[PDB]
């Protein structure tokens, strides 16, 4: 294949109250770059474009990885810092609504589908290769890579879950939910900025670290 599902799976495996979330975010940003490098053809893109994609996508990408990570947790999510967060805490911090949307629309759905790792990685690769991100030197190139992920993912779904006729569609239909959830989470991250933050995360919220880190 042009976008081998194997190599995508390798990338996910290769990567193993409010302030705790921001701590967890800053650390995962580093891991994310390593993940993006392991995605086929990502490193082959122009450096300025690799930057643009990660700046546009890092938010949805992280939410997806921690959602899937939290499949075993009950009424809570598991952060990369190792720390847990629970409903009760989230509502105490005025972040309860967005928290419940994440559990209902991502963690729950992922659990009930028994969404596997390959499926996750492909969705993350789709998010990553976003041709609508502003300032790309060649959006077509990026559009083409996303489309290969479509094909590889669907193929995978028909092979591994032949009985599940609508599985491919079910996976893609999480993305609109994820986009809207991503916009609301970003909103909160901006409020935290306005009111104890870490360095890389700060760079992502700002309109250098990232450049060096992928050379």
């Amino acid at each position: 294949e042009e976008m081998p599902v194997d190599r995508i799976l390798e990338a996910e495996l290769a990567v193993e109250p409010v302030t705790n979330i921001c701590q967890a975010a800053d650390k995962q940003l580093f891991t994310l770059v390593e993940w993006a490098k392991r995605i086929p053809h990502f490193s082959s893109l122009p450096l300025d474009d690799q930057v643009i994609l990660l700046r546009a996508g890092w938010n949805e990408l992280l939410i997806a990885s921690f959602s899937h990570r939290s499949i075993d947790v009950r009424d809570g999510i598991l952060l990369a810092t190792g720390l847990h967060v629970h409903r009760n805490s989230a509502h105490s911090a005025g972040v309860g609504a967005i928290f419940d949307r994440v559990l209902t629309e991502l963690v729950s759905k992922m659990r009930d589908m028994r969404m596997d790792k390959t499926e996750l990685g492909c969705l993350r690769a789709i998010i990553l290769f976003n041709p609508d991100a502003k300032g790309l030197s060649n959006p077509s190139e990026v559009e083409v890579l996303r489309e290969k992920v479509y094909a590889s993912l669907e193929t995978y779904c028909k092979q591994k879950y032949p009985e599940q006729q609508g599985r491919f569609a079910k996976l893609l239909l999480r993305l609109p939910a994820l986009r809207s959830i991503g916009l609301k989470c970003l909103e909160h991250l901006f409020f935290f900025k306005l009111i104890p933050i870490d360095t890389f995360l700060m760079e992502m919220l700002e309109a250098k670290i990232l450049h060096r880190l992928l050379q």
Binding site: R101, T104, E105, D132, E147, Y150, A151, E154, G166, F168, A169, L172, L173, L175, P176, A177, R179, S180, L183
Partner: protein
């Protein structure tokens, strides 16, 4: 691989419902504030007229969307609070789909109702902003490349309505169950229309993601209108939460439109 009779008849029903709705919208063309003609008076009234013109078109659009929803099989079996919640969120998204559908790539103009043809600049003269205008046209261009027919558009509109993740949806499991047949029908329809192009269907579904962004870009536009003291009519204020009183939903205008 194959289209069920049931499926064919459902698609047929949706397509028919849209044409019936379009016809009603054209009836309301004389209702619209005329688009100002001649050189603009210093009074500044041409601007207010262009803005009122567009605003009225939007109103009709909302009526058109409500009329359509009621004819989508299943929609009326939901509770009235969810019908409202689904339309509030999707109105702008559907508006944008319907907008793209009326884009001409040769004139780079969009045609509303029968013959209200407007370019980018017209949109700007009407009081919208470039940060909103440009994405609308980018999205129309994108849609045109896809080459959708009336059936694909209708189906996508139905699917968009039955998104269970909208705010204040009390019975989300019911909405996903409704959405699924429409998704299945679109898979079948597009795979029969274009068997040699497997990417057509994921391409379409991914437009629902674009529309979440555009809904947000539109929020940034509403913010600018308030800032410019452009007041919106009740219906649009209700649906998009703009002004005190109507924005809180105390008028129940949408409720009423459904009631009929």
């Amino acid at each position: 691989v194959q289209l069920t009779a049931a499926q064919e008849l459902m698609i047929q029903q949706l397509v028919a419902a849209q044409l019936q709705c379009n016809k009603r919208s054209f009836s309301d063309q004389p209702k619209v504030t005329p688009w100002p003609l001649g050189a603009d008076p210093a009074s500044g009234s041409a601007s207010q007229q262009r803005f009122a013109h567009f605003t009225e078109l939007a109103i009709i659009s909302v009526q058109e969307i409500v009329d359509f929803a009621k004819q989508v099989p299943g929609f009326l079996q939901l509770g009235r609070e969810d019908q409202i919640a689904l339309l509030k969120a999707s109105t702008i998204e559907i508006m944008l789909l319907e907008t793209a559908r009326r884009y001409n790539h040769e004139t780079e103009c969009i045609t509303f109702l029968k013959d209200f043809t407007y370019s980018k600049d017209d949109f700007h003269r009407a009081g919208l902003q470039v940060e909103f205008i440009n994405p609308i046209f980018e999205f129309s261009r994108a849609m045109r490349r896809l080459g959708l027919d009336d059936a694909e558009y209708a189906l996508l509109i139905a699917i968009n309505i039955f998104s269970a993740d909208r705010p204040n949806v009390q019975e989300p499991g019911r909405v996903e169950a409704l959405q699924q047949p429409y998704v299945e029908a679109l898979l079948s329809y597009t795979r029969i229309k274009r068997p040699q192009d497997q990417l057509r269907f994921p391409r379409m579904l991914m437009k629902l993601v674009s529309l979440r962004t555009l809904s947000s870009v539109h929020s940034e536009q509403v913010f600018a209108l308030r800032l410019q003291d452009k007041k919106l009519p009740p219906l649009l204020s209700e649906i998009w939460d703009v002004h005190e009183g109507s924005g809180s939903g105390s008028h129940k205008i949408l409720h009423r439109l459904l009631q009929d």
